[PDB]
């Protein structure tokens, strides 16, 4: 009937919904894991470096010191970021 | 001379991932773009409120609503722990 039908209706848009929302709630493992990584990652850039001084290489060297910026950038970013997804980017990828 | 076949290497190797940099810098602006499209949902649920009243159309009324709390919750829910 008319109000049965837009009601199925309201149901089946809302709870497409609630599988996102039940992951943004959930206590999750990695947290700065993710972080852990990027950490990980510049300590090892920053051996690299060491190594590329101690045989004059250059082109090692360069590649680190390049390398050395976007870790940077991208770990300013993380730690920037909030405690908020922010963005409903969670919906569909 | 081989210094060259390393800048190249170290060229190709670092460009490779610019892209990557340059995705994670604009997840800020979509963040500012997702606050100012909140707000857009936000007055869009309200005008459909008055508008199921004056309709008596409550399924819309509760579907927006509900949206509303659902969408609130994912992009502003702090994140546990």
Redesign the interface.
């Known amino acids: 009937m008319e109000?049965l039908i837009?009601?199925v209706?309201?149901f089946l848009?809302?709870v497409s919904?609630?599988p996102?929302?039940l992951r943004?709630?959930?206590?999750?493992q990695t947290?700065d894991i993710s972080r852990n990584m990027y950490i990980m990652f510049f300590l090892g850039v920053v051996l690299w470096f060491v190594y590329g001084i101690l045989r004059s290489?250059?082109?090692?060297i360069?590649?680190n010191v390049?390398?050395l910026f976007?870790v940077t950038?991208?770990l300013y970013?993380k730690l920037?970021?909030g405690?908020?997804?922010?963005?409903?980017?969670?919906?569909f990828q």
Do not use: H, W
């Open positions: 109000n837009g009601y209706a309201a848009t809302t919904f609630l996102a929302v943004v709630v959930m206590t999750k947290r290489d250059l082109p090692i360069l590649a390049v390398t976007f950038i991208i970013y920037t970021e405690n908020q997804t922010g963005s409903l980017e969670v919906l």
